């Protein structure tokens, strides 16, 4: 495992380098949209971002050290959490709005409960002045942590490696805060503040997964085969 031998700065560089792109949506201000077709824009976009996420995950230090079975499981559990934190990160500089794409900036008026939660989370990032180096650490933590407790002694070795990588990402977070000149007390407080955010993100994800399920049942919003399989994984 080369992952366990990286320094904090190397970890941050690796993560930063591996960042997926922001994509465009097919939104057209001159075209009329129903609630359903607007939702179609978002699910189409999520589908494309997923493809990029899967390839990003391979570049997260330690991830490919895992069996394909375990990689599949982690992504199935974390995918929506990851999409959401990316969305909130992007929207941070746009009070009251979510930036799904450079050409699609939405307020809550233009699912509303989830939208509001996402807005609250973006508001929180602003309150905290979340840094990009902190953001990429958090996102990798979600990938590794969300499914780790839902997997022989052989399968237990896999979990140990994940916990080791998780500890390394914590060390990196502390390193980043120390360099920013925070006191030791402030470092611990901020680390806690950041990780508690992960609870709210998990909450929003669970809520979204249920609304994704009802969207499937109503069969009015088009869902990609990949989204349907991801949805299926959550049963």
């Amino acid at each position: 495992s080369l992952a366990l031998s990286l320094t904090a700065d190397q970890m941050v560089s690796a993560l930063l380098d591996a960042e997926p792109p922001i994509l465009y949506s097919e939104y057209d201000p001159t075209r009329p949209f129903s609630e359903a077709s607007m939702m179609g824009l978002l699910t189409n976009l999520a589908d494309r971002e997923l493809v990029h996420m899967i390839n990003w995950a391979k570049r997260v230090p330690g991830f490919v050290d895992l069996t394909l079975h375990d990689q599949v499981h982690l992504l199935e559990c974390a995918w929506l959490e990851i999409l959401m934190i990316g969305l909130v990160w992007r929207s941070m500089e746009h009070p009251g709005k979510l930036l799904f794409a450079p050409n699609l900036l939405l307020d809550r008026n233009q699912m509303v409960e989830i939208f509001d939660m996402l807005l609250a989370t973006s508001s929180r990032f602003r309150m905290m002045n979340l840094q990009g180096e902190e953001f990429v650490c958090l996102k990798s933590i979600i990938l590794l942590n969300s499914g780790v407790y839902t997997f022989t002694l052989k399968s237990l070795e896999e979990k140990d490696h994940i916990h080791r990588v998780l500890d390394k990402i914590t060390d990196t977070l502390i390193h980043l805060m120390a360099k920013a000149g925070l006191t030791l007390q402030q470092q611990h407080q901020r680390l806690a503040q950041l990780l508690l955010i992960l609870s709210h993100i998990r909450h929003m994800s669970n809520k979204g997964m249920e609304h994704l399920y009802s969207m499937k049942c109503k069969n009015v919003v088009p869902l990609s085969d990949l989204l349907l399989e991801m949805l299926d994984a959550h049963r």
Partner: peptide, 9 residues
């Protein structure tokens, strides 16, 4: 699984 295949590619 689509995810399984994409992860192998």
């Amino acid at each position: 699984k689509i995810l399984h295949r994409l992860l192998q590619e």
